[PDB]
Symmetry: D3
Subunit: 228 residues, 6 copies
Amino acid sequence: HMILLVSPIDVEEAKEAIAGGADIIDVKNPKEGSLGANFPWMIKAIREVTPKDLLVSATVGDVPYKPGTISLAAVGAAISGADYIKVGLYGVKNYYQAVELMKNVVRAVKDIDENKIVVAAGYADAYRVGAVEPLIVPKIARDAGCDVAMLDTAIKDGKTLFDFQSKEILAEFVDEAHSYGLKCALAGSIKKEHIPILKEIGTDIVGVRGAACGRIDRELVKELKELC
Amino acid sequence: HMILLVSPIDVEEAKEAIAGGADIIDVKNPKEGSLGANFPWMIKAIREVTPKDLLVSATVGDVPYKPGTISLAAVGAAISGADYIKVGLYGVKNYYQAVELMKNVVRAVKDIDENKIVVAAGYADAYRVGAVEPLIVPKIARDAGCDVAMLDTAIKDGKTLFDFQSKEILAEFVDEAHSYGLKCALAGSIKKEHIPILKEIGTDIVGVRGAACGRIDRELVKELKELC
Amino acid sequence: HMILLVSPIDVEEAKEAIAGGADIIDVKNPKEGSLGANFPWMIKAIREVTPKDLLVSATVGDVPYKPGTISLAAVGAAISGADYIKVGLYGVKNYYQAVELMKNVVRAVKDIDENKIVVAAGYADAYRVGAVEPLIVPKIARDAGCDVAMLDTAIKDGKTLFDFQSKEILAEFVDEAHSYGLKCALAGSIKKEHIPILKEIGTDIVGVRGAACGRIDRELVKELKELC
Amino acid sequence: HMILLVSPIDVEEAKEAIAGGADIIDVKNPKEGSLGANFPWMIKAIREVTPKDLLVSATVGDVPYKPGTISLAAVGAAISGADYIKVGLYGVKNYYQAVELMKNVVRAVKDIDENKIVVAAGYADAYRVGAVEPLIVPKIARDAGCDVAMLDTAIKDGKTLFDFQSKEILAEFVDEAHSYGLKCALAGSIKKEHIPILKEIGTDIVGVRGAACGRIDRELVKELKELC
Amino acid sequence: HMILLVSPIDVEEAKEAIAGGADIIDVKNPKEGSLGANFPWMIKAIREVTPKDLLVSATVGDVPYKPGTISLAAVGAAISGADYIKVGLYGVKNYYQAVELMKNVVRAVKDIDENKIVVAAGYADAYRVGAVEPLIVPKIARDAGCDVAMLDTAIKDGKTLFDFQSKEILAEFVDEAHSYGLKCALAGSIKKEHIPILKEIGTDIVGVRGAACGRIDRELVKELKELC
Amino acid sequence: HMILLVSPIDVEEAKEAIAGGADIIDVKNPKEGSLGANFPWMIKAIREVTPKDLLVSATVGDVPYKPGTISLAAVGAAISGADYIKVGLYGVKNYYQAVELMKNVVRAVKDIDENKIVVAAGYADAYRVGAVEPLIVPKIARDAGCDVAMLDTAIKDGKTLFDFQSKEILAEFVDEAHSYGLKCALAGSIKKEHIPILKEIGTDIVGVRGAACGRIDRELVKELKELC
């Protein structure tokens, strides 16, 4: 079974995603990057509109290597109502820098609530932005004590997760994350056609917006949910 | 009268700064830059050790132009016990970018408590790092609804605030901040010799570490406090 | 009352600008940048064709921080017949560099004739080119002993002065320049629609080319002059 | 016979260079680069102190590719009293850019006085600064209608002309300049030991300062003059 | 008499070039740059399909300044069947770096076969890519002991050899190469119209592809051969 | 059992390494980078002096992403007598670029001699130079059909393999390479103290120079060999 994560642009789109059967309502800000951070008031508004039985995810940004700043930002997201706190490993260049930043984020979030989930997200197209190698995100997540290893695309030019990573390499990524006791989330201009492929490789969470649109349509969210 | 702000490296140095008569205990992390952010657990530990009649300040970083990330970081610092939240205007390039970021930080902080103080900090040596022009900091603080306009040095190579800014320009900066109803904080490898000059021009807050030292000595803090 | 400055590409366009009622005939070279310098023979030819009761302006370039070179260039422009000598503050990064360069240009020009006018020009979109903050241009002009504080756009991609600066900030810029005894010139793909706004805020000089057009039409210059 | 060119730092050093037997008194500003431009008032003061029978040289800078600005700067230097106007081919990247800039400088100077001399100067160590290839300076000078082809060093780290160019390549440079009817000037931390080598290859002008120093000593200038 | 060099994209295009009367069959890989290196198996396949009375040329790349790597690559090209080993002087910045790299390539090739020919190729548009000045290529080839001095274009945007170099400068380049006992090859989006000009100046080898197309046609190669 | 690889600077150092018990004699050129390529004549001289029962290794460089150039260079190294052909994965940015380049090198080498060994070498400190993530080298080597997965240091500032990679991460690297049927070589300012650690984790080959010195001493090589 695959969990459906939807990233609405506003409170109205969140209601649509909820009505359609989305499992996680993700709060991000595309103007600030792939995993750009939205504001504390927006995360709070989204947690307020989201039913109790569903989880809210929020990004802290396509982050530079600033452990202190990002640890404080993760506190801001958690306090604001995020159940999943997601870090875009953008400015971190290698395994060690990424583990150092993520360890501090993990401590910061768990200190707010031990039940909150930390997501280490790498970019499938990291080479286009100089970000940390995506294939080492499962080890970064394992060694930092994260709960979820994720991939998304950094540049939103229409090129998908599958244009940057082969099915075999992605299947290896998922297997490796699972071997470390982690869940695996995959996104990057995902289309309905990609859903059975992601389900097949054992992906735990799929992230979408475009596939549900143009604005989010509950009928299309329902269609995606059925495919999961 | 000038308020003395001291930036201790640890809880032990904070106790030393408190014992010596420091008015504000500033929590920063030099490893992450001039106004590098420390961790939520450190801000909390410092507020716990600091007497209730003294204020705690915390930096959110030498920030990139990421309003959402920085607004969340400001929440993290405020929740952790910071009374003053300081933003290093590093990655912001002009007046508009700086106002947009600071307006969002002001909302994030004032939403928690209208009594918490927001400091917009520019770099006296901004040109060495590509940061926003320091002389427009008072207008950025005015237009973003900040409480304090501050200058510090970006590069810690021993060059002081006075090596980058003339007494006349600094006196103009202080007068302009006061004309907009703001307080003015000045720092940048400040030495004991600089204190009467800063007092003379009407500076509200002086920031130090090196002058109180290599470790923070309460006797040296006392000496600086007497000069204020 | 607003003075109309027109920047013709050749002697024929200058005649058109003169016939249409332009007050200042500005000699620049767009091939070398926003305020690119034209040649001594062109400034001389333009002053020869321009009636004695009108003033000739000439740019010395989108200048790097080379006080000696620019002071010599200001001499070249003045000797060639320029009444206004305009410096594009491009390569100067801060207040101090800009004041040092402009003080030397002011000496070079005032030594020739105290009646010749020195214009310190900043870019409304300075952040796109790394140039000195435009909002400190009035203080640079005050402290260097310039006569006019000006703004123009650095990149000629069709984005105007009003796309980079708000009416309120521009009104503050004009008021500040006037408070220091300076005149204020504003340009940056100015359109006919912008003229009443610029007049309203107390702008002394408006610079155009595109609005008077693709070639300078005397009828269009007349229309702009009537609006001033 | 080799002509001795000396670059004094002030009017007092110029008097010393004159007394020692220097043939050309060169006015440059090392703070602005290898061939950094001094101010119009300094060139004028040097021409005023220099006897009628000696020539004054002045640089217009380590120039960017800005023909208009540099043509105006050459006018400033010529008007100020420079007999030789020297252009440092720094920001020009190839033959065509260098010829375009130099042709305009040549027109500008000759329009002031047909008897004035234009010097195209390349850097022996151009690769260290990205400047135009020094070995093509004789063709640039020929094709732009310059009078002198020159080489100097861009970075003043103590590395000489001979550390960057072999005697054979320099002899070829001199022969080529002579074949085009040009004079050849050579400089670049020249020492007394280098003088017979430069004379041997047929160099017309040698540029010094250090070899005459520490301040210029007329006795050492006399010694260098005897070696020429 | 001018020799016709054609650069086919595959074995089939090579056969067309051969049938049409091409004298040299050049093996390059546009994906890796202007003079990008193809693979050993491709050079071998081309040498096999080419009649023994015709020569095969192969590039080793738009090379960085890595003498050892490039000397080994030249061995690879020679062993693979290349008669002409062409080096694109891309990453070399000046005369000395280019002579050092080329001397090592010459030794590497000569140690395989004394009869194999070494081409030192510069870019007519070197300024666009930061490559060594094209006008010094004849001296680099002379001093490194190369057999051929060549120019091509670095960027394949449709701008030709004649857009970057004047006929006079090219005639000087050819004369200089001949004076050093070298052959001269010229290429850079050459069109049929350029052929009589190149023949007139004494060019030994002309390089084409586009002028023979769209795929290479033997009829078009025949037409170009007649013009040679 | 660990194999001892020694990188001598000359033929005399190679003899010392051989006499001391070195198993692989590695030919590199530090002037061109960490894994800078030496010349064909040097590889040939080393293969000649080395007893036939020992293997010779040679680097093709800290390579840019130029498959054709590098494939030709690998042919040059193989033809010259290298048994191991080592590629420094420097300019390749990700898994895909590295696999593409390495697959071509593997084909080029195999076409010369099936018994020759291809080493895919990554940098333990890749982040300092922008090179491909070292932790994905075992997958690159597996997928390109290489025989050996190696790590070395890019910058020779005295910082070792152990300063950049933890013993656990290195043990994982070795286990992963072995799981894909590869051998693992580790180097990077290795000291005698590091040898038991490398042996413990199952490293197949250890690379040294400094630990055997100052020039290579057979007594010191013998000591290192005993530790292996």
